[PDB]
Amino acid sequence: TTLADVKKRIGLKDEKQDEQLEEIIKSCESQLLSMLPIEVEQIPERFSYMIKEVAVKRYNRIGAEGMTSEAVDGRSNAYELNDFKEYEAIIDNYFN
Template identity: 40%
Template sequence: MAVIDDIKAMLGLTEDTTQLSTIVTLTESRLKALLGVDVVPQELEYIEVEIAVRRYNRIGSEGATSHSVEGESWSFKDNDFADFADDIQAWRDKQANESKGRIRFL
């Protein structure tokens, strides 16, 4: 299932929206920059989905770090990717270990 389809399923949406497409594009771009890749690896697409859902749910509350009304309160992190820092680092470590090779001259 494509990332956009996973996000729509989690949000209960049936159609793409411009907002959703923009959120997915920006989230994907940021994740690619953090990973140093041109394409988000399939095993890390869940990060893209989770963060896009969070960002979609915050529409209208951008920039707020906390919100409280009649006993209900919300607080938002400054860095959406902070919860996934360990996963991102583990992936990067794995890539570094896999890319090490040997060259032998005969």
């Protein structure tokens, strides 16, 4: 994806976090490209949105990558078990 479309969804209008988001996006693209069939050299444009969706999931999880829950003084998060779980089924069903 562009950075700017992940940026637009999360409403983030400054530039203070582009160094992190560019690494997150580079990570999501690499992982999705790992989930495709071994032959497939390019992410299908049909799936180009998954990179953006997971990048937003990961943006929210900054500081809780390995943690199932996180709390302090009445701010608390609990996180789902696998960012791509919704999409493992779709990627499967498309190639099978």
